[PDB]
Amino acid sequence: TRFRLDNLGPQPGSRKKGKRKGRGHAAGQGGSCGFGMRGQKSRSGPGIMRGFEGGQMPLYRRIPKLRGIAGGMRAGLPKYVPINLRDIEVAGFKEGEEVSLESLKAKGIINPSGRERRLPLKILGEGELSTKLQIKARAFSGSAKEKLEAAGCSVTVLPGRKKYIKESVRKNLARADEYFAK
Amino acid sequence: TRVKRGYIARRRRKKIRFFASSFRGAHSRLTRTIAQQKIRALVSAHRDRDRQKRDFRRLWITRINAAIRERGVYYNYSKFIHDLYKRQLLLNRKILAQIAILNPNCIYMIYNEIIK
RNA sequence: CGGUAGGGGAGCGUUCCGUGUUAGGGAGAAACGCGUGCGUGAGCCGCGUUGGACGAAGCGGAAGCGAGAAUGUCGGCUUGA
RNA sequence: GGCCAGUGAGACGAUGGGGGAUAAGCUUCAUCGUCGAGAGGGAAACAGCCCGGAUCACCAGCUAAGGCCCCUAAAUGACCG
RNA sequence: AGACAACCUGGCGAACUGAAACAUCUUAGUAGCCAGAGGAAAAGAAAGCAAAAGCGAUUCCCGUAGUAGCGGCGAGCGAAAUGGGAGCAGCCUAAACCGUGAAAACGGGGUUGUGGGAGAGGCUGCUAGGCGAAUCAGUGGAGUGCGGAACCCUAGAUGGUGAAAGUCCAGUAGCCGAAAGCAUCACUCUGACCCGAGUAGCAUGGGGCACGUGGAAUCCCGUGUGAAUCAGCAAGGACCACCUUGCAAGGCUAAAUACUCCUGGGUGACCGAUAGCGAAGUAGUACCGUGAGGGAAGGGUGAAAAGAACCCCCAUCGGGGAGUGAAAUAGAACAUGAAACCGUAAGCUCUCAAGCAGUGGGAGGGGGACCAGACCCUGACCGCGUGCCUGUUGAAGAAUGAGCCGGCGACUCAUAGGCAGUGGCUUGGUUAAGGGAACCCACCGGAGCCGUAGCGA
RNA sequence: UUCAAACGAGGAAAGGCUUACGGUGGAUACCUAGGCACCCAGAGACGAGGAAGGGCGUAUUAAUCGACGAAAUGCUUCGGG
């Protein structure tokens, strides 16, 4: 049996055939069309406000508003693009040549796209590494340092932040560190 | 894709009219009034088919009663039915009444040998 | 296995498109009016008259898709006479 | 617990009460019946009382409530008041 | 100079509405009026973005994102940079200096940002056209259709022709062609002096930037004040310091973008005379209105007028024979010709009846050119039976609605959010714009989006 | 057969129902003589050498519609057929 424009059809259940509504009382939803009997919801046009409690004070206006979001304070939008040690092990390589934003993006389950794309890595010990690799990243967790130094991975923090400071601030900090020296 | 109705209306209203084409006056020839009346005709038919079953029985009982009272001076339908079941005899009212018409000899014969 | 509001399931038709410039058709199509066929029904199916050229299925698709009510609306024709 | 409705005018009857004039087919609550949304039979006719819950066919049968002089199915039945 | 469908620039500028009322706010700088101009218009060559990493004039699409925000923090309103595309292009001018008094009014010298200056030392297309392959008969009005036998094709796009044609016609694929006109290619610095002045800024009153005056920046304005000149000025969301970026108060500039009174070419799960433009007929007509203004309806004899010589009724109209024609049960009121409504003919049947007109039972009578206990029409007389809809606690209702008959006449579409069914992928999935001998469409485009870590302001 | 009683058929209507055939009317069907929407190119004109739009004309013979303008159903020139 060969496929032609004669033979084809859909599978049972895919295309439902909807409700042309108000075409006889046998078809069911007819003459008033499943809206009962007069009143605000029967009429044509927009319904109400959504969340409207009827003139009773709505929930969305009788509860206080979530501490930080009540005038300023941008919500804690995440930094660092967290991977874990548990998530790395599935993407295997013997001398794991710099597990970084490059290699993981090439394959390892990490698709930064939007504002994510400007972020560094934080590596976070969810658990274990059977193999010895070389890692290249920003900042590691408390467990991650322990597990990496236990595994024996050539771990290297690489910064690239460089804050401008101001000559006066540097003078002050040079005074500080100078004093700490003596 | 404009869709004129045309064909689909009066091809059913002909069938609606086919029912009512023995009716008397306005009812036979006026679309919406025919549609109003056909329904009622069918309802009275359905209703009267069940009236039929009890009414025929009620006629038959009267026939049998009329037949049986011509025997003895004090003998009567009520007694007759219990005398049938006393002797174990499953003749239904239809048969009894119709033989009472078409062959009264046979009712005489049934009456004679039920008493004993 | 009564059933209003009301919810859920299963269908019938309408015009148009794919299949299809298909077969069927000036030895008569669409229509229109009649059937002592069929179906639970919406509807289906054969008929020879009127009619004078369009156009079934089946498998699929899409809607200006189904009317008796709106002091609806357009046209026709009554009643009062 | 998910998706997605209608409802938010109720009515009468029994009981427990309030208001009223222990008037109202009055009104307001509490518990239950029926109507509402329930055909059929009894009640002359008679939503709300009594019987009983209609899937469909039979020109079969038994019964509930209620009845058996005639209109109009069944005893012008019985015995005692 | 006036006219000009929309699009566009500038001036003035509503209200209904939403906020379940309403004044802030929203409707909206929308509708309207007014002025102006082009094929587009406006914008536009940084006193700009951005963050210590960089970008390089505008304008338009995807996106970021319904995020950051604003908001009687209510209704609502709502960005941009980074990123992907479409399309790219950059110019000129004034003074400091020079000459012909001198800001009498003319030429030269230069105009730039991680500082720059001058000074002194015929080609093709369009507007007409042209040539252009291949079929014949049987078929009872007519053949392109049917069965038969052929042929062409770089032509099987279309419209016609007595009936639907690749080969009958006009054409088409394919090639050919312009006198004339339109479009297209054709080393130093005195750090002298220069850096757009009633300007910027400032006070005060406003407008507008998503941003309601708010901590309110940036941009523009009435009133009053009133700077500086690259050892400068302005911006980097009050403000000061330090960095970085730029050069305001003079101008010009193609593209990508918006639209349809309109022309040519193509296409349609568009309409087919109550539809489609209001308008298929000499329609913005007839008609109404003082006037602005409103505003209809009315298509289909046949292939061919062959549209009926002649005769009869007869003043006409019209009619019947005749004749034409496939058909005149196509005769101009002409094609198919439903219903209501109006009749004519036949079968049965009502004048002691009472009835939402039916229904169950069925007396007597009638059939259909087809021999049936079958079927149909009528229906003596009996029993039952409170029109439909809406909408009600409850409606036969003397509550509402419809004179009847036929048409038209109502949960749609676009975009998003949730959920279900189905399918694809699960090496996670998916692409948006945008590109495609257009539209679909192979095949590209990974920019973004969703999932892979929560907790806390 | 005389007359007493009963019973009342068969004939007999305007109309009703059924079938047929007409008329009225213009639904449905098939249709086009006009519209509608997109896509690809263009174009967005014209006017003081008088416009957009109109009044009045212009043929051998009445009306209108288009064409045309006292050079008035047209005139000149260069091309095509």
> A41 in helix, strand or coil?
coil
Distance (Å, rounded) from C-alpha B26 to C-alpha B20? Answer: 10
Sign for the pseudo-dihedral over CA of A54, A55, A56, A58:
positive
CA B93 to chain centroid: 14
Q: Which of A86, A76, A72 is nearest to A141 (CA)?
A: A86
Q: Which of A82, A89, A100 is nearest to A132 (CA)?
A: A89
The answer to whether B67 and B100 have CB atoms below 8 angstroms apart is yes
Listed in sequence order, the residues at least 6 apart from B71 whose beta carbon sits closer than 8 Å to its beta carbon are B108, B111
A136 phi-psi bin (left φ>0, alpha ψ -120 to 50, beta other) = beta
The answer to whether A125 and A141 have CB atoms below 8 angstroms apart is yes
The answer to whether A138 and A100 have CB atoms below 8 angstroms apart is no
Q: Which of A116, A115, A155, A163 is nearest to A139 (CA)?
A: A155
Sign for the pseudo-dihedral over CA of A12, A14, A17, A18:
positive
B11 phi, psi to nearest 5 deg:
-65, -25
Amino acid B87 reads R
The answer to whether A86 and A126 have CB atoms below 8 angstroms apart is yes
Give Cα separations from A33 to A18, A21, A44 (angstroms).
14, 6, 12
A155 phi, psi to nearest 5 deg:
-90, 135
Residues in chain A: 182
| Declared resolution, Å | 3.6
> Which bases of strand F sit closer than 7 A to a protein CB?
16-19, 27-29
Q: Tell me the residue range of the domain where A132 lies.
A: 76-160
A9 touches strand C (CB under 7 A): yes
Q: How far is the CA of A142 from the C1' of E83 (A)?
A: 35
Distance (Å, rounded) from C-alpha A62 to C-alpha A64? Answer: 7
Beta partners for A154? A134
Q: How determined?
A: cryo-EM
DSSP string covering B46-99:
HHHHHHHHHHHHHHHHHHHHHHHTTSSSS--HHHHHHHHHHS-----HHHHHHH
Q: Which two tokens stand for residue B67?
A: 């037949």
The answer to whether A135 and A156 have CB atoms below 8 angstroms apart is yes
Give the relative orientation of helices B104-115 and B31-68 as an angle to the nearest 10 degrees: 50
> A155 in helix, strand or coil?
strand
Distance (Å, rounded) from C-alpha A163 to C-alpha B107? Answer: 126
Distance (Å, rounded) from C-alpha A39 to C-alpha A47? Answer: 11
DSSP string covering A72-136:
S-------S-B--HHHHHTS--TT-TTBSHHHHHHTSS----SGGGG---B---SS--SS--EEE
> Which bases of strand E sit closer than 7 A to a protein CB?
19-20, 52-53, 64-65, 68-69, 73-76, 81-82, 215, 241-243, 269-273, 275, 338-341, 357-361, 377-378, 383-385, 387-388, 390-392, 404-408, 410-412, 420-423, 428-429, 447-457
Q: Which of A123, A124, A126, A128 is nearest to A98 (CA)?
A: A123
Q: Measured between alpha carbons, how far apart are the two ends of chain B, in Å? A: 88
CA A64 to chain centroid: 26
Burial (CB count within 10 angstroms: exposed 0-12, middle 13-18, buried 19+), residue B27: middle
